[PDB]
Structure 1
Amino acid sequence: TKKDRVNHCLTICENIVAQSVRNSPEFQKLLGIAMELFLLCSDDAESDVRMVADECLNKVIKALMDSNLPRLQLELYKEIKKNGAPRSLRAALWRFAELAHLVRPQKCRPYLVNLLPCLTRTSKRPEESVQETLAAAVPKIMASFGNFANDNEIKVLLKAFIANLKSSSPTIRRTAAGSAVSICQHSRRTQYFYSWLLNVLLGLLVPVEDEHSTLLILGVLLTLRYLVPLLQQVSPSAEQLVQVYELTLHHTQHQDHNVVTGALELLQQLFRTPPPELLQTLTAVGGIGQL
């Protein structure tokens, strides 16, 4: 049935694209069935089945990217809504992000509301392949839906991703850092959330003397490194920035070389693109003694 499954999907692959009418009521139902079959066929034991299902997954999308994009977005999201197999979810997730920017502004608010639980729920998935897909899907989705989000809604997503900063897996620990920074970058109040994220990240480590998990230290230090370039112009203050610089200097003396190299990377990111308030402090003869 291996050849049957490939041929059957390939049969519906060419059938749906080579069809004169693209708005008949039967076409909408048939497109949904054809869509979900490809996602289902995207997670099969035979590898060649998978490179055929996904190849026709976007071949149908490219052909119908103009006539029936709203229907394709609904079908792609319906797969993400049902948290399923890692290969099928990440197959729908990485395509929904690509077509996210083609949604008209009148439909960007309902999608964001429905997609907020999906982004939080998918962050809990421990697979290192799902996290990699979500690491790329969040910047694309936020860049198209971020401005339609309430101030508390951004806080919900940030708190969900911050909880993954202490994970053992670097892929989970790096996806959380990238997504958290990118969520703030594409929000309405970019400067407000930059300061809001900065104190939250600092509050996770600013009790310097007390013990902190090495996993948490690596997660926060990476998040600051992703946030430093975007701080180059309420808003983050020179007191917050100098606190980050002091946090970096302390952690270069850690025992774990991963922490040492993690903080050292942040230190060079600070010096490559220094925020103007911190740069004035670091260059003044009395720089931090005044503060």
Structure 2
Amino acid sequence: KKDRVNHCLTICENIVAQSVRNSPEFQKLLGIAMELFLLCSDDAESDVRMVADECLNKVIKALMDSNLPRLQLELYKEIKKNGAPRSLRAALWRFAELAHLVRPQKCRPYLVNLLPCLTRTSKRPEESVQETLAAAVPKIMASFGNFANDNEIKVLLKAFIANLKSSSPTIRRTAAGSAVSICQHSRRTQYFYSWLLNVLLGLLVPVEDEHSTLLILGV
């Protein structure tokens, strides 16, 4: 049991103070440390996960002045690989908590990289990944959504409107919240509210059809 707690907790105790930062050794050591903790965030024992959670948090707090863009590249890579659900969640909400710290010269390429991730994470059936994405979208879009174009936004809105028919109340809540927020943090808010109303009325407008209770509840 405890051996991997001693390993990650001593890796956390070390890397906050090792060597000089921005060196060619420290970039590698920090990559391996994030890879190790995000893996330990999905290990099969309770106190191991709680210690991995406080190891990621202490290391981000310690290195924000100096390695913020590398921390966000490591968290993004764990989102990109779409793995086990606690491993994905442990990266996703942390990336969303850091999203305001990216410099304006770095928002556009993260917008382009995250839409393939958000549109894969909305296709995950597990409700805890969805409750995490429901928190992440209103923070991600408030940090990147003015850097999107209209076709990129319409791809996100389509990916969440597809979920309004779901049997899970949580999936419908995640979609209903995400779609309105994606519009709200666009460069074109009044147009996107108009487009989203045309979709939402359009989904119930042929009022004689056998619409499902699930789709009505989402809309």
TM range (shorter): over 0.9
Bigger drift between 155-164 and 20-29 goes to 20-29
C-alpha deviation, 1:162, in angstroms: 0.3
Cα deviation 1:138-167 (Å, max 9, x = unaligned): 000000000000111000000000000000
C-alpha deviation, 1:129, in angstroms: 0.2
Structure 1 counterpart SS, 2:203: helix
Higher normalized contact order (CA 8 Å, seq sep 6+, divided by chain length): 2
Alignment check: 8 A CA contact 2:19 2:26 kept: no
For residues 108 and 210 of structure 1, the distance between their equivalents in structure 2, rounded to whole angstroms, comes to 43
Unaligned runs of 5+ in 1: 220-290
Cα deviation 1:88-140 (Å, max 9, x = unaligned): 10000000000001000100000110000000000000000000000000000
Residue 33 of structure 1: aligned partner: 32
For residues 79 and 215 of structure 2, the distance between their equivalents in structure 1, rounded to whole angstroms, comes to 29
C-alpha deviation, 1:22, in angstroms: 1.1
Residue 200 of structure 2: aligned partner: 201
Runs ≥4 residues deviating over 6 A:
none
For residues 202 and 66 of structure 1, the distance between their equivalents in structure 2, rounded to whole angstroms, comes to 48
> Rg bigger for which structure?
1
Structure 1 counterpart SS, 2:2: helix
Residue 169 of structure 1: aligned partner: 168
| Count of aligned positions | 219
C-alpha deviation, 1:20, in angstroms: 4.6
Alignment check: 8 A CA contact 2:130 2:170 kept: yes
Normalising to structure 1: TM-score of the pair? 0.74
Normalising to structure 2: TM-score of the pair? 0.98
C-alpha deviation, 1:181, in angstroms: 0.4
Cα deviation 1:30-84 (Å, max 9, x = unaligned): 0000011000000011000000001111110011111000000000000000000
Alignment check: 8 A CA contact 2:40 2:52 kept: yes
Cα deviation 1:183-228 (Å, max 9, x = unaligned): 0000010000000000101000011122201100000xxxxxxxxx
CA RMSD of aligned residues (A): 1.7
For residues 111 and 29 of structure 2, the distance between their equivalents in structure 1, rounded to whole angstroms, comes to 26
Alignment check: 8 A CA contact 2:35 2:74 kept: yes
Unaligned runs of 5+ in 2: none
Q: In the alignment, is residue 23 of structure 1 matched against residue 40 of structure 2?
A: no
For residues 211 and 199 of structure 1, the distance between their equivalents in structure 2, rounded to whole angstroms, comes to 20
C-alpha deviation, 1:19, in angstroms: 2.4
For residues 66 and 168 of structure 1, the distance between their equivalents in structure 2, rounded to whole angstroms, comes to 44
